[PDB]
Amino acid sequence: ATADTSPERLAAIAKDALGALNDVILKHGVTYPEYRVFKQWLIDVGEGGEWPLFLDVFIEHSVEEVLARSRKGTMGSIEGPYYIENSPELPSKCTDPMREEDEKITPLVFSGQVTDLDGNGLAGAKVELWHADNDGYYSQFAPHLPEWNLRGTIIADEEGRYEITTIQPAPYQIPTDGPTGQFIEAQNGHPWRPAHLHLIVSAPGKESVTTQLYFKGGEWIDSDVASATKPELILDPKTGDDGKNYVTYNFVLDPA
Amino acid sequence: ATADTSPERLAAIAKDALGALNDVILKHGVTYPEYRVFKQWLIDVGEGGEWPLFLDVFIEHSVEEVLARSRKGTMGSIEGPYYIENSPELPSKCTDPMREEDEKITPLVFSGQVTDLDGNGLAGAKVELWHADNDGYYSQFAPHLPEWNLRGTIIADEEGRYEITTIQPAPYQIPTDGPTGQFIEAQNGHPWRPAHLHLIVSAPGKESVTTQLYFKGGEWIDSDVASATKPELILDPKTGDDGKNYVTYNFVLDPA
Numbered sequence: 001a002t003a004d005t006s007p008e009r010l011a012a013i014a015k016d017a018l019g020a021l022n023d024v025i026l027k028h029g030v031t032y033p034e035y036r037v038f039k040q041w042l043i044d045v046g047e048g049g050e051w052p053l054f055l056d057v058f059i060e061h062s063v064e065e066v067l068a069r070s071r072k073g074t075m076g077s078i079e080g081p082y083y084i085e086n087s088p089e090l091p092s093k094c095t096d097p098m099r100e101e102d103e104k105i106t107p108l109v110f111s112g113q114v115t116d117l118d119g120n121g122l123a124g125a126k127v128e129l130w131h132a133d134n135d136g137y138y139s140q141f142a143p144h145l146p147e148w149n150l151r152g153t154i155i156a157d158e159e160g161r162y163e164i165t166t167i168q169p170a171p172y173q174i175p176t177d178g179p180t181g182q183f184i185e186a187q188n189g190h191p192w193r194p195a196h197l198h199l200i201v202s203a204p205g206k207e208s209v210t211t212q213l214y215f216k217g218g219e220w221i222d223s224d225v226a227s228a229t230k231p232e233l234i235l236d237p238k239t240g241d242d243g244k245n246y247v248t249y250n251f252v253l254d255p256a
Numbered sequence: 257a258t259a260d261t262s263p264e265r266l267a268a269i270a271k272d273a274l275g276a277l278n279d280v281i282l283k284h285g286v287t288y289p290e291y292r293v294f295k296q297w298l299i300d301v302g303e304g305g306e307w308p309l310f311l312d313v314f315i316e317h318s319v320e321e322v323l324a325r326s327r328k329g330t331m332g333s334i335e336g337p338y339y340i341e342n343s344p345e346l347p348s349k350c351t352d353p354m355r356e357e358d359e360k361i362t363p364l365v366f367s368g369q370v371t372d373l374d375g376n377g378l379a380g381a382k383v384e385l386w387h388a389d390n391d392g393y394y395s396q397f398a399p400h401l402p403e404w405n406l407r408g409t410i411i412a413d414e415e416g417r418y419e420i421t422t423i424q425p426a427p428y429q430i431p432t433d434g435p436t437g438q439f440i441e442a443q444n445g446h447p448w449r450p451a452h453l454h455l456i457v458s459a460p461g462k463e464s465v466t467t468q469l470y471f472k473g474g475e476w477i478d479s480d481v482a483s484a485t486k487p488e489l490i491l492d493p494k495t496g497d498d499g500k501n502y503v504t505y506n507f508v509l510d511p512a
């Protein structure tokens with residue numbers, strides 16, 4: 001990973017970041033014993049491989065909040081740590097790869113169109129979708145799952161349209177047996193995200209959007225540990241006589 | 257390491273700490289590419305064993321600043337990462353263990369008395385001293401050095417007095433081939449501390465003090481990378497006809 005950043009830019013960032021953390025220590029009167037526990041917890045986070053996990057929960061939302069300022073199209077949200085590139089391409093009407101156990105779950109039929117800022121349908125558009133199974137696992141981050149379970153890249157039709165069938169996502173618990181869990185448990189926090197879809201939607205000439213979609217009424221919608229849910233990203237699916245949940249949502253991309 | 261800290265206390269600390277870091281991201285418009293470099297640098301700090309190093313430089317001074325509020329005796333300073341307990345006991349008049357190469361250095365003769373807040377000399381008092389060699393190495397953090405090089409615990413006399421001979425400390429460069437060095441180099445910073453002695457001074461019934469002493473006129477006195485030097489802790493040694501540097505400094509301890 002490389003950035004553009006000038007020494008002068010880094011210096012300024014570092015100075016208020018360090019200055020703010022130091023202000024918090026003074027404000028709360030952080031003690032030597034607390035400093036020692038903090039130092040061991042940092043070490044533990046690294047040893048536990050939880051930097052991506054911790055940062056995406058507690059920091060990423062601010063970085064997307066920045067990116068949001070320059071965007072006029074559909075609201076973005078955090079990526080989180082479980083995106084994988086090159087998920088297998090699928091037709092504009094399709095179902096995600098899934099296991100026999102996933103076929104037990106109420107299906108979700110997600111339809112819509114990828115457009116520009118004026119609502120024109122975009123040719124060449126792609127919808128990359130990934131999400132957790134009903135057990136709260138992501139493929140490629142769970143040894144028992146086939147590697148593309150609930151992952152694909154949907155090739156939208158000539159008008160930018162898609163119809164994607166998957167399983168209805170369920171609330172997502174952040175892994176709690178590590179340092180991050182310890183940190184949340186230790187302040188009587190709630191290690192939970194509302195049920196969600198992750199998406200990256202892209203089109204030639206357009207800026208891709210990384211976002212997430214949630215479900216009206218869902219548990220943890222008003223208390224996402226990642227602070228990443230937005231009102232604009234809440235779906236209200238309707239259940240059909242086939243027992244499936246149907247919902248349409250359009251993507252609106254900014255120019256590149 | 258354990259603290260007392262209540263969940264409610266942790267929650268409040270975490271909230272303004274996270275809230276402040278998030279404020280800095282928004283203030284500077286931290287970009288996705290910068291976020292990725294930050295995430296890899298955190299990982300690098302852990303992999304490099306540099307948590308103690310980084311925190312003691314950039315964070316500890318604030319934690320001592322808190323502790324300072326409740327103290328009336330001699331100014332404290334940061335401990336830094338190189339204190340070792342149980343350094344070999346020495347008489348009230350003594351010289352620190354050192355190598356033949358250290359005997360090449362101009363000697364420093366450090367005298368004084370350990371007292372209470374009213375200036376009464378304290379019996380039972382101890383002065384634990386450690387500091388870098390002229391090459392900028394600390395024993396036990398440099399494979400070539402004998403383990404107590406420039407380390408001891410001085411047993412002060414019945415009146416709390418000591419006379420300790422050592423070598424004149426020289427400016428201290430923080431280790432720069434790791435993530436911390438990278439971080440400092442990347443903002444055109446200065447990876448240097450002024451020459452210093454580290455001390456922990458203790459007496460029965462009294463609160464120990466962890467502090468440091470520096471040298472009038474010394475390089476980096478006005479630009480310590482650790483932000484840890486205090487005007488009150490600056491020695492002005494006088495050179496005798498024997499070529500040695502003499503200085504007296506008294507310790508004034510708070511009640512326990």
Ligand SMILES: [Fe+3]
Pocket residue numbers: 080132172196198
């Ligand atoms: Fe997720």
Ligand SMILES: [Fe+3]
Pocket residue numbers: 336388428452454
């Ligand atoms: Fe030092």
